[PDB]
């Protein structure tokens, strides 16, 4: 009946965005920065651009790039020994989601007594992190936008989730200059997580019409774009759309939650560690067919939004289109079409429904199904 | 080329967000509050609701009532000592603009050397203000979402604004239930100014994907909704939605800004002080038909977004009948139609052109225009 | 939110309805019948054909013909000496809106303590009046199927009314060859009557989708059925249809209430007294086309119901249908366009305004008005 | 020819209606109720919400659980014993068909001297019942508006049937807010028992336009709510329009009657016991292709009502498909398609076909056939 709408302070969107890093350290009263970084991109101008401007408005930087992909406890543990021992002020991330969820742990186990896994679960924080400036390379996981922090646990094998406005990061900074050097293959699979961002806001129990402004328009976005993003990706006008596209599919998920889409993802990334990317696009048209039971009437309208034609049709077959049309967009931008070559096989199906009917996501499914239900979705994407 | 986006860290919405009010200042620190509202509005069940939640939320309260209809520097100053001589901590504001400019206004002069003007501009501030929560009664203005702080000097009979990251809300409210008690006039009139938020954001120089998702939706919900909640205040669906219309008109205006249509309607409300509202809505056609000719384009976005069927024409045809469907709606929910009858003269055309050129909503206005292009908008309005 | 929908618990409709009057009293416990109705009604072949099966089932009867257009409250008393003295344990009421309204006047006075005007108001009405069978000879009122009780009060001129559960008859009965002796012109009164009651009961505040079922199928049935009814009396199917219509608009406004266009109608009928059958029919567009903005979607369901083409149409443009079509029908069946024609006063309209925004009927009118905006629909109509 | 029409005096539905219970109880002079009910049913909160309400009334309650689904004569003689007993003035009946059907034939049983299979067939009651109060829990039987009381003889095996307008409760009561705990594939079951009910008053030999007005829109209703109800059974809008939506199809088919689709689902109820709701589901199609030739005309108006496009159509294209749209909905709530699986036997047809004819409602189908034509519908479904 309420909602509440979450979402950083100041953001900042378009090519050559990253100049600003620097001058929002000092206004946020920043002397020495945090940059928390993949290995990977630690080699080009990506985390170097960052670096020039941090240098250039006079801050002080001691680097991270102790981050994993799928960030660890450790990885928090590890980074928060050079927060402290090199005493830094603020925290620049920089990259996709990994940099993003680490830099919040380190922000709340620098700020909280003691120990990380303890403030698991919601609003369950009590002091401010230390300022986030959190620039983004890539159009998919919206995590500088998010309340979210997971990160994976060592001791037990399993990730833990911490939700609370505190975690939203002071600044975020989406520049798709830093964007292009993504090969054709992951501005596909992120794209696609974007696009699944978008349509699970979309039918969500928790959806509104504030959380729709950002998810229509992010659908949209996605299906004029995608595809010419992932042909060339040297393409900015299709790099700009992508990247304002992910950040508004994440102003939105992260008020509306998502549904059975990252329920069953999550467990692919569990049991296969599929990229989170894919794993979300073999998936999305198999579980929206599923979901389309619940409201046909937005499935309506997300075939509109993506470009079909509507005009004689009766909202059960607008809605059709609707998968049609991610199967279509799914087909076109390269994502492998079965779970079968994906490395799944078909006994893990009854473990992973199990585990994605108990997954956070799964509460705000506009579907609520089963354990069987969802081992048949499986089958039917397999 | 590139963007900024602000907006209030943590905001609520829906009916009886006023519940969170007391257990936001808690956790924003806030031990004794400053409740700065209307003397109209200070009784009934309103500003009662939001002095019953801070009192079980255990937080003590100084009201300060003092709020004119068009926020003073003097109405700052006079509430500036109730905040300092009864030691508050944060800042509770209630009602439509006025209490929100003032309540910035006065979080501005606790927190920088003393003076109204004095920080006028941009970028000014140095120094974070006292935590403001913003609890807004009307589908209006959406300065609880706004940088702006807009007061008028006693000094020079002139307003001044203070624009800045800094004087964004710590959270906003807009509560339905709260806005029920709103006359038939005052509906239509604020839902115009909404209405003319989001389509002087949508075809704004400084407009982007991302603000134009939340100028599209609200077009869609007020095309959809005023009508039916003029016609009925007591009805909630439309309450509902006319007050995310009006939050969402803000997210974008506050990030692309506006144009002619304040631009002009400011210079109504400094002479014959005309109402905001009704100033923007008889103004709005006529400047949308003079801007047309900037983006055709998204003029027929707007037709088709206020429920139009443009699907044989010409986008110029397309583009006159959002125009056709902007005057509709303002004739249908009883806005007069002619300048002549608000009691504006004809004399004052020149002058009144002259300062509108000006002022600051000007240079984001899609078409460049001269002091004889404005005038004769005018004249059609007459 | 909750809703009540009441009816009597047995009814006859269809050709020869009337031939189960008597064994419907047998089955009531009825050994002796006060046969209520007018003195037009009551030597042809109407109230005669209701005396033949009454005799042959073996109810013997004792008939009472002072019944006024409008029934007064002296009716009443002279009804219950008629009903105390000769002994009755039945009521069969045969007639238009008035000998029904005068029937359950009589069952009321007949078991409630010594006086009629002290029981006007909601449920106020303890016991269980005698049986009331129900013989309808109008394609209009629907009284036959209503809670509602009114009389005048010949000490005030005023009328007032019992609202109530127990007013409903036992039997209802509507009978289409009963009907066939109706000049044009009150044909299409009692038509546009049953429309009105239709239309107000379809965009009433307290509307629902089990209310609208009944509406929905009235006004397609008017639209289908009523010229051809006025064009030509003895048109049984045209007759059958009116009568069907009648009964179920009757379902409808007996449980979603009327409007604007009733609290209006009465009050001409108040100076006038014009037959309220063309009062609600010249007020009908009027009064509809202010109501528009209220539900404009319902309003273009209307045009469609009533067999407009509104495939291309925006909302409003389908709307628009609805006001052209009722406007048709009405020119069509000769009923007068303007109030002036009808000697209506234009001084007049300030104090029906005021008298028709208390009447009982305008608290449920979709559109919250006032005095003037009342007023000024009369001048519409004028 | 000529039509009656049966329906409760006083019918309350929407969110909280069962509020009124005590109430209601107290109107009709119940002093002590006899609350009748499953042992299912009655712990959680539903005839604890009954029981609330009525003791809160100050009504003393008794209460008899003891109804079987397929309620046999042996339950009434030990309902009856405890309504005696305890010295119960009113009976409250809570549950689907099963509690309604025996809460009527212990009040028959109270009333009507000596056993029970005696008092089968028609008009055959002589004597008023207890008052009744009728709870309904499913949106599925409609017999809380119901003129018949079926129950089992245990003597015979056989069913039997007691048809009168005594049977008709004095109250029903409908809250979807009760209803919100059914299972998918119960509330699937019970959604296409109400589907069937429509469209088999809508085309059977009995119907006319007062019987079609509910028909209509429960088919309308049913078409845009049953996927979503079935998909989220906490979707408060759906339970709403379901329950108002098998009311209706309720008041249609207790007036216009049923068809071949009951005269069969009752003999696969009969030798497999298969739920009511699914036996209907899984002929519906079948049957309706069957019927097409008996009135293309209403199949037509039956598709436009699910939702289909017919604009460009002949009846008999437009009637075609009414079938699809059927099938469609059936498969689209996981509806079992063939007979096969639910362990039916092909050498049972002829047997089944036979009872089929003699069924009650076999009567009022708009075709009529024979044993080998009724078999060979079992053979299109099997
Ligand atoms: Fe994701
Ligand atoms: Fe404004
Ligand atoms: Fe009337
Ligand atoms: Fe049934």
Known sequence: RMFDYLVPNVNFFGPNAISVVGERCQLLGGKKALLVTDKG??????????????????????????????????????????????????????????????????????????????????????????????????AGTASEVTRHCVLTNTETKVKFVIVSWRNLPSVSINDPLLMIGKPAALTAATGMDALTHAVEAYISKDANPVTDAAAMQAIRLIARNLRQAVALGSNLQAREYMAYASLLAGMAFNNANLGYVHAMAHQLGGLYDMPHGVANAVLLPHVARYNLIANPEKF???????????????????????????????????????????????????????????????????????????????????
């Not at 680097?63 to 090199?86: C, H, M, Q, S, Y």
């Not at 609707?322 to 070559?341: C, E, F, K, V, W």
């Open 41 to 138: 991109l630690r080699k080009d101008g990506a985390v170097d651009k960052t670096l020039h401007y941090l240098r250039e408005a006079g801050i002080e930087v001691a680097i991270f790039d102790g981050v994993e992909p799928n960030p660890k406890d450790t990885n928090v543990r590890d980074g928060l020994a050079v927060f402290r021992r090199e005493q830094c002020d603020i925290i620049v991330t920089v990259g996709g989601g990994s940099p993003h969820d680490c830099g919040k742990g380190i922000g709340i186990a620098a700020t909280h007594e003691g120990d990380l896994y303890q403030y698991a679960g919601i609003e369950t924080l009590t002091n401010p992190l230390p300022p986030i400036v959190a620039v983004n390379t890539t």
């Open 300 to 382: 309506a309208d997300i075939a509109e939004l993506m470009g079909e034609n509507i005009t004689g049709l009766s909202t059960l077959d607008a809605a059709e289109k609707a998968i049609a049309a991610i199967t279509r967009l799914s087909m076109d931008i390269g994502i492998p079409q079965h779970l079968r070559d994906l490395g799944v096989k078909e006994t893990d199906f009854p473990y992973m429904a199990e585990m994605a009917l108990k997954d956070g996501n799964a509460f705000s499914n506009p579907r609520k199904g089963n354990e069987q239900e969802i081992a048949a979705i499986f089958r039917q994407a397999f």
